[PDB]
Amino acid sequence: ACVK
Amino acid sequence: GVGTVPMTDYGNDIEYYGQVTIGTPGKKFNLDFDTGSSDLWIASTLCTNCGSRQTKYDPNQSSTYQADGRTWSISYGDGSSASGILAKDNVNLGGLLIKGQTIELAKREAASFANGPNDGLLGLGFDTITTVRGVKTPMDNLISQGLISRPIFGVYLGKASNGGGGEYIFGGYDSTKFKGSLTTVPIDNSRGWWGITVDRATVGTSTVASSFDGILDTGTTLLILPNNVAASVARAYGASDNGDGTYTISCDTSRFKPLVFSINGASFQVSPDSLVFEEYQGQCIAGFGYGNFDFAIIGDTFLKNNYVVFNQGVPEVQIAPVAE
């Protein structure tokens, strides 16, 4: 994997 | 004046979500807690592409729903997204009842959200990057409503190898989760994020990076570094570029030294076990990666090794190694  | 939220670790330290109750009498939602964004959005009965496993907010089923109706739309660094309309409702966070929080009802969400563990996100970045300008974040409201005295939240992210879990404390922190004394670190919030400077990075006695900036982001899985830092760290560990922002690394971490960041005169590390994020079919993907960013995204690879107290008021953080 996530990139938030 | 303290809210405690036990977290669930999804899979191999991919993300960490907690339950949040929204509305009156209230539905319970599992939200990814994300210091890299500032929107509180949830799957709703207006959604046309959401997942059958998700809990859906229904305006008609909350006595304290307040209409708003303005559109919102968010896109995340990993290509996921959601959009819909604004509303306000009461949001219970670990027992603290925020009155009239702006919530973001999904009409659409990316397929990855429809197939994942989340009903939405809880944004813990600064309010200057809310997708609708002027929306007040949950921490803004906890502070302005006097629901917490200390304008802080303490963050422990567990390791799946230890049984997972995690815990956020709004208005306080949990000293049983860290070793030694907390070190204060100044925050640059000018781009809406929890920005810090890493003075140096080392592996053993070798310097692998001079100064670089980064953001403390609970909503990113890996430690994403600028390409040159990433490549230097990869060289230090013998890792090979997969071409997709990830590296292949040896699965045996027994001869790896920790990756050590020097931050405001103290040391904070990624432990050797955390240098491997994933094993699949005998191949291991490293806990660090790259993504063509000029600054680091200091994600769960690092945070599951370092307890952080986030202070929005100053702004600043305090960091200490996890007790493990």
Q: Three-state DSSP class for B267?
A: strand
Q: Are residues B173 and B153 in the same domain?
A: no
Assess contact for B288 and B298: CB atoms under 8 A: no
Residue-by-residue DSSP string for B279-293: EETTEEEESEEE-S-
Distances (CA, A) of B129 to B80, B132, B302: 17, 8, 24
Nearest Cα neighbor of B118 from B162, B169, B54, B182 is B54
B202 token code pair? 């080392």
Sign of the torsion angle spanned by Cα atoms B308, B17, B90, B43: positive
**What was the structure determination method?**
X-ray
For residues B203 and B262, membership in a common domain is answered with yes
* 3-class DSSP state of B34: strand
Q: Catalytic annotation on B217?
A: yes
Q: After which residue numbers is chain B interrupted with C–N beyond 2.5 angstroms?
A: none
CA distance A3 to chain B (A): 4
Which residues are CB-neighbours of B24 under 8 A, at least 6 positions away? B62, B63, B64, B89, B90
Chain A contact present for B74, CB below 8 A: no
Structural domain of residue B92, as residue ranges? 3-168
Q: Which residues of B touch A2 (CB under 8 A)?
A: 14-15, 32, 76, 78, 80, 219-221, 299
Q: Considering B168, B194, B222, which residue would you say is the last residue of a domain? A: B168
Residue of A nearest to B287 (CA): A1
CA distance B37 to chain A (A): 7
CA–CA gap between residue B166 and residue B16 (Å, rounded): 7
Task: Give the whole-angstrom CA distance, residue B8 versus residue B6.
Answer: 7
* Number of domains chain B is built from: 2
Do residue B158 and residue B245 come from a single domain? Answer: no
Q: CATH number of the domain that B163 lies in? A: 2.40.70.10
Q: How far apart are CA B101 and CA B46, in angstroms?
A: 19
B16 DSSP β-pair partners: B9
Co-location of B122 and B204 in the same domain: no
> What order do you get walking across the sheet with B240-241 strand by strand?
B240-241, B247-249, B283-286, B276-280
Residue B121 to residue A4, Cβ atoms within 8 A: yes
Domain ends where: B168, B189, B224?
Answer: B168
Which one from B9, B13, B32, B34 is the annotated catalytic residue?
B34
Residue finishing a domain among B148, B168, B188: B168
Whole-number Å distance between alpha carbons of B8 and B113? 16
